[PDB]
Amino acid sequence: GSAERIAFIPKLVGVGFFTSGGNGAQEAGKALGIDVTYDGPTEPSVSGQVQLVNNFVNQGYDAIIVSAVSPDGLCPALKRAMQRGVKILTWDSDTKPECRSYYINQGTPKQLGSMLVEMAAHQVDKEKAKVAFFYSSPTVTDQNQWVKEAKAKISQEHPGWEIVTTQFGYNDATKSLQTAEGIIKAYPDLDAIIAPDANALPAAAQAAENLKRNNLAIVGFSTPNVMRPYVQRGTVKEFGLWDVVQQGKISVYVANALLKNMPMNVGDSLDIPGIGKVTVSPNSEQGYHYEAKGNGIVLLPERVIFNKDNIDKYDF
Ligand SMILES: C[C@@]1(O)OC[C@H](O)C1(O)O
Predict the structure, then answer these.
(1) Integer Cα distance of 116 and 129 in angstroms
(2) Domains of the chain, each with CATH number or no CATH
(3) How far apart are CA 142 and CA 92, in angstroms?
(4) What does the record give as the function of this protein?
(5) Mutation to probe ligand 1, out of 43, 66, 67 (largest number of atoms < 8 A from CB)
């Protein structure tokens, strides 16, 4: 019969992380004979994503995979989708667990929070330090889950560190650069910026270069292709991510499994070419209390620390 149709929705288009995730989703679609539509708003917003969800539902799509800008903002549209039998998955940034079926997740908040703090500590290497957090928004699901854990870890394991500020760049290159320059100017006693956002990290690096700020540890999460110039110049020594192309791929393979009615309750696994096995984990892995039939989290097998040694191995 007519080929299945899956939508893959980023927080916004035109950012390398999301372009690369979309590439993985679309290549998986080709391998599986599924038509995958990559579409998102030009900036992150609830209305941008909600219209797309509603459009794809109204147009008869079989599954929608979305990286949510908000835990709650998409819920009415996603609940309508699920009421109509459209498979709903999140990837990257979750909604509330009751607003989707599966979350294709790069890592637990404990894992990702730990990565951020470990990267910072490796470079700071002193007990008394001043650190700034810098990411997209105070409401986005993923980054706030990770930052809560990173801040807890700092308070426990680095008691001499002071978090002097937490500011936001809203996935906007212009606003992010201005915010980063503002942090560096306002806090001359600053030892690290921790920037778990694909736009905030290069903005912080660029701000440090613009202001000729030296010996500032700048760590966070972004893509190798975006970060490579900053790593080459030495402004960023280390940052983290994961294979976002593979994440997009996994999301489409999981959606395919749902469309084929394969067993995907907590504990079940799924074979994916070039990856091996992925498994459905409980929602409690993300800190949620919610369990239901046909609902859980699929964790990526690995995350990656990038530095000068390995950055040229990766093209995304
Ligand atoms: C990489 C990241 O931190 O920046 C944009 C994404 O939503 C992300 O995973 O949060």
Answers:
(1) 15
(2) 1-105+243-300 (3.40.50.2300), 106-242+301-316 (3.40.50.2300)
(3) 7
(4) Part of the ABC transporter complex LsrABCD involved in autoinducer 2 (AI-2) import. Binds AI-2 and delivers it to the LsrC and LsrD permeases.
(5) 67
